[PDB]
Amino acid sequence: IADVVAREYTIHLHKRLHGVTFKKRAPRAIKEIKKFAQKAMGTSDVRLDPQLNKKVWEQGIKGVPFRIRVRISRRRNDEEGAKEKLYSYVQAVNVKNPKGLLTSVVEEE
Amino acid sequence: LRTQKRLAASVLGCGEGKVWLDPNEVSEISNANSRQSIRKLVADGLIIKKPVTMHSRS
Amino acid sequence: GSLAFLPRKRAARHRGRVKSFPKDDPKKPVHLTAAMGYKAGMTTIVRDLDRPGAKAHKKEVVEAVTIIDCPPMVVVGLVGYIETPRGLRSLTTVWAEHLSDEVKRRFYKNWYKSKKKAFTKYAKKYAENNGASITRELERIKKYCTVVRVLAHTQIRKTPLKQKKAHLMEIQINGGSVADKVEFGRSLFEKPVTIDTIFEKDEMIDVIAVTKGHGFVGVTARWGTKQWTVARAGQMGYHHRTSVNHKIYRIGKGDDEANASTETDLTKKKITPMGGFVRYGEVNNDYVMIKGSVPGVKKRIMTLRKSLFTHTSRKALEKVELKWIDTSSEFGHGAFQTAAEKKQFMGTLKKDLQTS
Amino acid sequence: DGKNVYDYIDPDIDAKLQALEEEEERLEKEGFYDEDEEEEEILQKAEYIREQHALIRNEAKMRKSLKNRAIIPRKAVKKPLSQLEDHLDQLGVDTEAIGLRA
Amino acid sequence: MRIENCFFCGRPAWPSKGITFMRNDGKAFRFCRSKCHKNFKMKRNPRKLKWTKAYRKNAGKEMVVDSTLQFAARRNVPVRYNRELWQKTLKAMERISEIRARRERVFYKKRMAGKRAREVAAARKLVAENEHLLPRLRGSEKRRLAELAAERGDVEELEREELAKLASKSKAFGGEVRR
RNA sequence: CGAAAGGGUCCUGUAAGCAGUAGAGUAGCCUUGUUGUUACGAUCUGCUGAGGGUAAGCCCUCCUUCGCCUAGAUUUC
RNA sequence: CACUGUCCCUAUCUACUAUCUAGCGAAACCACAGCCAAGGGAACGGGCUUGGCAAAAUCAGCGGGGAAAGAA
Ligand SMILES: [Zn+2]
Secondary structure (H helix, E strand, C coil), rough: CCCCCEEEECCCCCCCCCCCCCCHHHHHHHHHHHHHHHHHHCCCEEEEEHHHHHHCCCCCCCCCEEEEEEEEEEEEEECCCCCCEEEEEEEEECCCCCCCCCEEEEECC | CCHHHHHHHHCCCCCCCEECCHHHHHHHHCCCHHHHHHHHHHHHCCEECCCCCCCCCC | CCCCCCCCCCCCCCCCCCCCCCCCCCCCEECCEEEEEEEEEEEEEEEEEECCCCCCCCEEEEEEEEEEECCCEEEEEEEEEECCCCCCEEEEEECCCCCHHHHHCCCCCCCCCCCCCCCCCCCCCCCCCCCCHHHHHHHHHHHHHCCCEEEEEEECCCCCCCCCCCCCEEEEEEECCCCHHHHHHHHHHEEEEEEHHHHHCCCCEEEEECCHHHHHHHHHHCCCCCCCCCCCCCCEECCEEEEEEEEEEEEEEECCCCCCCCCCCCCCCCCCCCCCCCCCECCEEEEEECCCCCCCCCCCEEEEEEECCCCCEEEEEEEEEEEEEEECCCCCCCCCCEEEEEHHCCCCCCCHHHHC | CCCCCHHHCCCCCCHHHHHHHHHHHHHHHCCCCCCCCCCHHHHHHHHHHHHHHHHHHHHHHHHCCCCCCCCCCCCCCCHHHHHHHHHHHHHHCCCCCCCCCC | CCCCCCCCCCEECCCCCCEECCCCCCCCCECCCCHHHHHHHCCCCCCCCCCCHHHHHHHCCCCCCCCCCHCCEEEEEEECCCCHHHHHHCCCCCCCHHHHHHHHHHHHHHHHHHHHHHHHHHHHHHCCCCCHHHCCHHHHHHHHHHHHHHCCCHHHHHHHHHHHHHCCCCECCCCCCCC
């Protein structure tokens, strides 16, 4: 219910990248992550971590992982006359295995 | 910063693929237009020459 | 190709219409003539054949059967028709009170934001004077109409579909005076009608649906080659087809919990395949087992109606006895009918030992 | 339910079933079916170590590339103040004792 | 009808399931699926493939000798039909099947007996040379609890409680760059 | 309604690691070896029908978790 | 002698197009026009006769028409 909220999700990119041309899977996985955080947080302004872009491109252009596990953080865009008042920042997180993990809210305190 | 990338290559004696510019100090690099102003930023650590790539013969 | 199906265009409506009910005579008993169901999928059976003159007489035959899920239709209306030099004209439609929200979804294209005011004033004429408008409209059917039909709709909550909009269809009453079938129609209001009562086992029925669509194709697959008669590219599929003489091999109850059990195999199992019907789900209601292939894709509404004529074959007068019904997995090369005899065959697994 | 009745058909099957139940009585009596903290904590302790190995291995893959690239030495890069107090705090070190504020 | 068994792997071959190959010497081979048939045509040995039941019997992963498996067999001398015999046969196979399952489960527990003790000894070895990676509490937490010790009287158990909490108790890569 | 998860159903074929002189073979010690030792060691066996994948046009969900929802633009007798 | 989609008899999979959008943006060709049938002596219609008919504006395919020997 708060404008500022950080949650952790698992993205099943295997079902989102099924049958795609091999030379577009890593570019399309970036767009599907942006589409994921737009829907899950209601914010069109989505920024991806450069180290999240490293995780997607880890095994080349046609080797995107089946399941990535990220944290999406809705923060307030102050700026000066911004078009949108909120934005979501997505970062890859360090877990032993991106399987069997439910969506959870992470407490800042 | 193409001029600074070219001049740092001549100052440091390497190629432009080994010249590294500070991402957080782009405003300071931009004011450097002389080969003495770049020699400042090399000594200060803002322009750094990368080493040779690993070529393990084993 | 055939010039009989020449306007190879898409079907005008998804449901598809009967276009001909059986010819009616008043000496017969009062009965309905059609029904609706949803296509679940197909299975494999073994039938102990009794066909005198056949090479497979008193032998075992393996046949393909189609399962159509049939939740009980709810009768909500009554429509009278009169004869005309111009054709046949609808004179009077009489609905009932307490119309369900499912059929009310049918009269709306955006149910989620509407005020849901359909048939609100029609609910008030049942208690306006004493129901004078309702009784007058039924007496108009009794004294002027030559044949009357019944409006019935299916329920989507009993079926595993993401749709919520019911399918509303007119079903003709045959066999009686117009006075007798009207008193059927008013008495049948607000009442569920099962497929046990409309049809019966060992009966050829007529199946009506819209076929599988294939979009724009060329003459290689649209016509079958190496003005109207010239083979030209266009739409293949999504055509309205009426299929003829399909035998009802079984009518399951849904309550019985041994639907796939026969008198020769004593395994308490249902018709749903092990793992579920692929892209349909589970059948938890009455179902009709139809021999052979049947038009339409899975999840599509199926219209079943009675045969127009008395049959001229011994295939229609054949009692069907089933030996076993396949219940194995549609999702692969399933070699197991129930969950119980897979664990009996496999033995103890690692996850079973860690959980227990 | 997955068996052929005709395979199991055999006369005097009561004698075979009674002898099997007599065997089932002998198997119950001498106990063919009976079931017989420090080990728990060290198993959980080993699970924590195996997780730390995977986290270190994942962070190694974050810096590594598929092909060898020229990289900046750590003596050349400059590291923030807040990262040193954060990492030494995980190591369980008094960061205020070492006057880490230089 | 008869539930057949696959020649290659032994799963039940039901009617209309699979293919049957007839050889010139009079022998018919029934298969349950295309995977079993294709592996037969390229002449691979099912005793070596670990998914076939010939391997499991050869490797001892299910037991063959006991009284209940001897009670089921293929019968070549027919009996006269007897309704009392057929009803009492059905009650036998209900008893037969549940006796098998309760002996299958004991057989599996006996094979897995050494697994339980071996796993704790391997994990005991793995802890003894990895002491530095154990949960250890932050220095700021040990500082907070140093004050608290004096207040409530006590230090030792306080730490054990918050370390038990730390065990009862995932970091993100990178961070936002300030504009 | 959506995203994950769990279970089911299928596909492949027995994961990483650990352990057993089963183990061909390669080598150091002191002296006769009739039973000498000490290390490494392909391969094999067990943990392990394990491990991986599973709807993208497969199935189900008992509080399995988390989130969203009476939007806002046009047109109409 | 051996293989082969050559065929019986065909099905399936991939990439770029074909499709749609944003931006950019020609040429060939063009009397005026484009539904048929029968008749229009000069085996010549598209404009005439008299019949069939005939309802805005459009989007994709096609392979028909709007093309063709000349007489010793
Ligand atoms: Zn098999």
